[PDB]
């Protein structure tokens, strides 16, 4: 109606660039390193941890069977 927003050319170019960053992406060595870390290295770390302790954590009502405090005090003298 009244165009309540004062459109800014620099903002529009900045907005358009952010929405179209895929156009200029290149699968260079820098990109490959970041892709490997987020999609392979990090999932592998969780992948190992998830199955390493899968079914090996019976924490429901786990009981204490070892005394906490020391009975006799041995002086340093």
């Amino acid at each position: 109606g009244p165009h309540l927003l004062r459109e800014d050319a620099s903002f529009q170019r900045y907005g358009q660039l952010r929405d179209n960053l895929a156009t200029y992406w290149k699968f260079n060595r820098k990109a490959a390193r970041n892709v490997f870390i987020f999609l392979v290295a990090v999932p592998a770390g969780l992948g190992y941890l998830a199955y390493n302790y899968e079914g090996k954590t019976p924490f429901v009502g786990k009981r204490r069977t070892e005394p906490i405090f020391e009975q006799d005090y041995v002086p340093r003298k």
Partner: protein, 90 residues
């Protein structure tokens, strides 16, 4: 009125009978919810014992606390698919 569980075991039915299988699934589920109800009642005893005992809760509620920790790992809903689809004897 209070409808009661139709006690039926997976070991005494034919799974081809869909009604008998349906009762066995329901009967196992209803028994598991009774255990949870029993666990909550036993926990209520522990809560009441702890408050009134004060510094004597270790001694006054020793057997109650031991009972709660033993029942806790298994007094929960486990479903029926595990026992329906598995034969422990084999």
């Amino acid at each position: 009125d209070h409808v009661r569980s139709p006690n039926v075991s997976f070991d005494d039915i034919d799974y081809n009978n869909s009604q008998d299988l349906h009762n066995a699934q329901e009967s196992l589920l209803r028994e598991q919810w009774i255990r949870v109800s029993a666990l909550k009642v036993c926990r209520k005893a522990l809560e009441s014992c702890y408050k009134t005992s004060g510094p004597n809760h270790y001694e006054d509620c020793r057997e109650i606390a031991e009972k709660y920790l033993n029942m806790l790992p298994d007094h929960r809903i486990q479903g029926f698919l595990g026992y329906q689809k598995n034969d422990p004897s084999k």
